[PDB]
RNA sequence: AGGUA
């Protein structure tokens, strides 16, 4: 279903890195330990990478297939398919520029 | 050093080795110069009226019982009575000084700065006054730089000539005519941009009116400020750099208990700076003693947050530590094992909460660890994806959808149509009973009666047999 | 909390036959692949329906 | 970890 004649590899630009990212990871938090709902805005986040379970906002607001083309604006969490969590990338805004080890050693 | 090194620990030790340790009186001398700097900045804020007006506004709010007393002031250099007396005499000094504006004025300013010398305020309020005076500096320099940009880029004259001619009143038309007097071409060119420059001068005069002091005194007072925080920051940085060894020594005790040593010393340096900002020698204690508790708190916070893979609250971490200590005590006393009954007895905590806490206290393990003690397979190679619908269930769902569509096709037009939107069958949306009734231009019991008729028709053992298999 | 019981929702009675009133298979009962040995049930959470 | 080819 996908057609492409070739693959390009190149240097990723900060602008296009932000283009890939759906949200900025600002906290090292992961989950609420007892409640395994991911934190905001941690490495695991429904507000950034998408909902954990199929087609429902992770706030208890919208739980249906009807709410799939519209994201939840009543809270940070958006509502889409869960497979989206396998594809959405994030970005971290480094305070100081950092050298790439591959281009170094 | 330059020894083909790639460890930040090594050259961090190199950096800390440059600064020599201090003595007990050395800390007092450095804190004394810090106190001199902070007194200088307090005097600079003293000569600024508007920050004092803001402080008096918050004092009045506190008197109206709208703000906390301990959020404005902390201690004094010789309680609500002392605060009230000092703020009353301070308001008197402020008004008697302001009256001299709108010899004698210098004496009033000196007495005003003296009556602030008694005040010792909360770091937050002091930081607010510092930021207000800093934005005063920013606005003054912004007006000056706007005049710079206009006169230079619009009249094509070098930056060197401006400093001599403009400085001295800076808020009058004297320099306009003075520069024009030499019949310079840029003087003639200035006549086409004179309106904007004069409007900016008007804004500068408005800023002066807001401050209530002439702009020259504003520059004098803010330069005194700037040198004040420069001295204060230099002395504080000297203290922090000289006290890194304490942080390193304290953190290396916590390194054997997990977590990177470098993160520990960085957090300890943060706590050390916090202690330096809060340190005083009027207490009479040693700086090391005060900084020790701050560093321990920072280290504990770091272990609580950045060492646990999953977040655990600091109070929960302390509860875990207490549970572990009491467990060790009971283990060494009874000599066999920590029994949950005694653990429940020692705490106010029931016991189910104890076991759930014990479960929480353990950290997650990597999948990259080998399952079976160094088998060439990893743990994550066995973890089944539980978020994926089984193809058996997907085929069952497809067959059920086909059967429901066929059955709905087996019914009448309006009944099947109502059923499609009532439950969201074969469209990506679902509609309520009243929503379907509105489109069917019948909003009454009739729509629900149609739904019930469809249900009753489906009750027959000719359309339910096909759906009977799906639900057992 | 999970519990062990003989009564399992939506299962055949053959499975219930080999268990006691405690939900545990009798010692010595002959079992094959797919037979139920322990009647564990888990408190079902929120359910999404197509 | 051990064992098989």
Swiss-Prot record, chain A:
Ligand binding (Zn(2+) 1): 57, 59, 72, 75
Disulfide bonds: none
Biotechnology: Co-administration of salinamide and rifampicin or salinamide and myxopyronin suppresses the emergence of resistance to both antibiotics.
PTM summary: Acetylated on several lysine residues in the presence of glucose.
Assembly, per entry: The RNAP catalytic core consists of 2 alpha, 1 beta, 1 beta' and 1 omega subunit. When a sigma factor is associated with the core the holoenzyme is formed, which can initiate transcription. The rRNA transcription and antitermination complex (rrnTAC) consists of RNAP, NusA, NusB, NusE (rpsJ), NusG, SubB, ribosomal protein S4, DNA and precursor rRNA; S4 is more flexible than other subunits.
The family this protein is said to belong to: Belongs to the RNA polymerase beta' chain family.
Protein task: DNA-dependent RNA polymerase (RNAP) catalyzes the transcription of DNA into RNA using the four ribonucleoside triphosphates as substrates.
Protein name, per record: DNA-directed RNA polymerase subunit beta'
Organism ancestry: Bacteria, Pseudomonadati, Pseudomonadota, Gammaproteobacteria, Enterobacterales
Name of the gene encoding the protein in the UniProt record: rpoC
From Swiss-Prot, chain B:
Region (Sigma-70 factor domain-2): 239-309
Gene3D superfamilies attached to this UniProt entry: RNA Polymerase Primary Sigma Factor, Sigma-70 factor, region 1.1, Winged helix-like DNA-binding domain superfamily/Winged helix DNA-binding domain
Residue ranges of DNA binding: 433-452
GO cellular component: cytosol; cytosolic DNA-directed RNA polymerase complex; sigma factor antagonist complex
Region spans: Sigma-70 factor domain-3: 318-394
Subunit structure as annotated in this protein's UniProt entry: Interacts transiently with the RNA polymerase catalytic core formed by RpoA, RpoB, RpoC and RpoZ (2 alpha, 1 beta, 1 beta' and 1 omega subunit) to form the RNA polymerase holoenzyme that can initiate transcription. Identified in a complex containing RpoD, the RNA polymerase subunits RpoA, RpoB and RpoZ, CRP and DNA. Interacts with Rsd; this prevents interaction with the RNA polymerase catalytic core and with promoter DNA, and as a consequence, promotes transcription from promoters that require alternative sigma factors.
Name under which the protein is recorded: RNA polymerase sigma factor RpoD
Species in which this protein is naturally found: Escherichia coli (strain K12)
Curated annotation (Swiss-Prot), chain C:
UniProt modification remark: Acetylated on several lysine residues in the presence of glucose.
Family: Belongs to the RNA polymerase beta chain family.
Source organism: Escherichia coli (strain K12)
Subunit field text: The RNAP catalytic core consists of 2 alpha, 1 beta, 1 beta' and 1 omega subunit. When a sigma factor is associated with the core the holoenzyme is formed, which can initiate transcription. The rRNA transcription and antitermination complex (rrnTAC) consists of RNAP, NusA, NusB, NusE (rpsJ), NusG, SubB, ribosomal protein S4, DNA and precursor rRNA; S4 is more flexible than other subunits. In pull-down experiments interacts with CedA.
Biotechnology: Co-administration of salinamide and rifampicin or salinamide and myxopyronin suppresses the emergence of resistance to both antibiotics.
Job description of the protein: DNA-dependent RNA polymerase (RNAP) catalyzes the transcription of DNA into RNA using the four ribonucleoside triphosphates as substrates.
Top-rank taxon, per record: Bacteria
Name listed for the protein in its UniProt record: DNA-directed RNA polymerase subunit beta
Range of the intact protein held here: 847 to 896 of 1342
Coiled coil: none
Lineage: Bacteria, Pseudomonadati, Pseudomonadota, Gammaproteobacteria, Enterobacterales
Gene that this polypeptide is encoded by: rpoB
């Amino acid at each position: 279903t996908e057609e492409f004649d070739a693959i390009k590899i190149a240097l990723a630009s900060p602008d296009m890195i932000r283009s890939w990212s759906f949200g900025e990871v600002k906290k090292p938090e992961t989950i609420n330990y007892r409640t395994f709902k991911p934190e905001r805005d941690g490495l695991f986040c429904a507000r950034i990478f998408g909902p954990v379970k199929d087609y429902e906002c992770l706030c208890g607001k919208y739980k249906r297939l009807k709410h799939r083309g519209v994201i939840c604006e009543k809270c940070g969490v958006e509502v889409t398919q869960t497979k989206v969590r396998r594809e959405r990338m994030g970005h971290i805004e480094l305070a100081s520029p950092t050298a790439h080890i591959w281009f170094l050693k | 050093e330059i020894g083909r090194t790639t460890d930040p620990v090594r050259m961090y030790m190199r950096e800390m080795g440059t600064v020599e340790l201090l003595t007990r009186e050395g800390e007092i001398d450095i804190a004394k110069r810090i106190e001199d700097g902070i007194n200088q900045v307090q005097c600079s804020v003293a000569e600024y009226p508007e920050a004092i007006t803001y402080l008096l506004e918050q004092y009045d709010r506190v008197e109206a019982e709208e703000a906390r007393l301990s959020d404005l002031i902390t201690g004094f250099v010789d309680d609500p009575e002392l605060a009230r007396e000092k703020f009353a005499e301070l308001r008197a000094q402020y008004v008697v000084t302001r009256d001299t504006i709108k010899a004698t004025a210098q004496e009033e300013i000196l007495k005003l700065s003296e009556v602030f010398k008694q005040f010792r305020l909360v770091p937050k309020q002091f930081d607010y006054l510092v930021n207000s005076m800093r934005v005063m500096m920013d606005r003054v320099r912004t007006q000056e730089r706007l005049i710079m940009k206009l006169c230079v880029e619009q009249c094509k004259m070098p930056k060197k000539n401006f400093i001599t001619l403009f400085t001295g009143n800076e808020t009058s038309d004297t320099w306009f005519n003075a520069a024009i007097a030499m019949n310079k071409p840029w003087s003639e060119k200035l006549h086409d941009v004179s309106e904007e420059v004069h409007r900016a001068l008007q804004k500068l005069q408005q800023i002066e009116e807001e401050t209530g002091l002439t702009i020259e005194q504003v520059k004098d007072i803010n330069r005194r400020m700037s040198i004040g925080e420069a001295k204060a920051r230099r002395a504080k940085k000297e203290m922090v750099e000289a006290n890194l060894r304490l942080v390193i020594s304290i953190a290396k005790k916590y390194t054997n208990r997990g977590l990177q040593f470098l993160d520990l010393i960085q957090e300890g340096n943060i706590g050390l700076m916090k202690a330096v900002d809060k340190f005083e020698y009027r207490r009479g204690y040693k700086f090391s003693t005060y900084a020790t508790w701050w560093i321990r708190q920072a280290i504990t916070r770091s272990i609580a947050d950045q060492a646990r893979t999953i977040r655990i609250p600091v109070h929960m971490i302390e509860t875990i530590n207490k549970l572990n200590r009491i467990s060790r005590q009971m283990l060494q006393e009874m000599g066999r094992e920590p029994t949950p009954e005694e653990l429940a007895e020692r705490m106010l905590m029931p016991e189910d909460k104890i076991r759930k806490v014990l479960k929480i206290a353990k950290e997650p393990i990597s999948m990259e660890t080998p399952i079976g003690d160094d088998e060439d397979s990893h743990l994550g190679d066995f973890i089944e994806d539980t978020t994926l619908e089984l193809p058996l269930d997907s085929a069952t769902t497809e067959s059920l959808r086909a059967a429901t569509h066929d059955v709905l096709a087996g019914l009448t037009a309006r009944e099947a149509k109502v059923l499609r939107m009532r439950f969201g069958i074969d469209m990506n949306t679902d509609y309520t009973l009243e929503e379907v009734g509105k489109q069917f231009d019948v909003t009454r019991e009739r729509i629900r009666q149609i739904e019930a008729k469809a249900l009753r028709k489906l009750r027959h053992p000719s359309r339910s047999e096909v759906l009977r298999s799906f639900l057992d | 909390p999970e519990e062990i019981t003989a009564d399992i929702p939506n299962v055949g009675e053959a499975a219930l036959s080999k268990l006691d009133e405690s939900g545990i298979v009798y010692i010595g009962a002959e079992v094959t692949g797919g037979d139920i040995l322990v009647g564990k049930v888990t408190p079902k959470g929120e359910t999404q329906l197509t």
